[PDB]
Design a protein around this ligand. Structure first.
Ligand SMILES: [Cu+2]
Lengths: 128, 126
């Protein structure tokens, strides 16, 4: 499988009120065996200067990351579109910050893949 | 004259509770003839992918921008360090967002320059 589509995209977005992340894969995702988590990333003193730097940080996290050593976003996932689309619904609106979603997916073809998708939320839980 | 340094710098910073922007120029700034404004930028639907894109948005603003066409930050400015450093104090903590600071400076050498500085505040007010 591979990721076809993700919203928010890999971008600095405003999106005040954001409370969901959507991923669309190229194949149906098998339930149970596929898992999804997201993190609010700690930015280094004086920040990051492009999304390449953000991607480097995000690439080190995974589904077996330890929650107490990081800042996990609590969320609930559901499968749709004959299980090719995954919607991650956050408990409350996401504040501003840099975020990564990480996964391990077993696809209908029987292969397991891992990956991540990262973005910068420049809006807050509500409109300025 | 040119900008030597700025804090926040041109980056994506967390900086929860940010309420001031410091700019340091290469020459003393003349008060009154020099002015400073800041704006919280509207990002496009697709978001932006890099800070060059941020620069593009910021570079169109200036000291003669119309306040009602934008989202201006209410602030007070203060000169120091024999007038080469400018501190911009925001009236409330800055909410998260992309920002631009713009200026027109008259330097003690009698020359006027314009410029801008942009950053992304990815943290909140606390
Ligand atoms: Cu000059």
């Amino acid at each position: 499988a591979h990721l076809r589509a993700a919203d928010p995209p890999e971008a600095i977005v405003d999106a005040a009120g954001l409370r969901e992340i959507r991923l669309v894969f190229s194949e149906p995702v098998v339930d149970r065996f596929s898992t999804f988590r997201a993190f609010r990333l700690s930015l280094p003193e004086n920040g990051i200067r492009n999304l390449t730097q953000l991607n480097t940080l995000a690439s080190e996290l995974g589904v077996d990351t330890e929650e107490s050593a990081h800042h996990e976003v609590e969320l609930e996932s559901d499968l749709s579109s004959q299980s090719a689309e995954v919607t991650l619904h956050s408990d409350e609106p996401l504040p501003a910050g840099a975020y990564a979603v990480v996964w391990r997916v077993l696809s209908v073809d029987g292969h397991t893949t891992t990956g991540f998708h990262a973005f910068v939320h420049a809006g807050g839980t509500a409109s300025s």
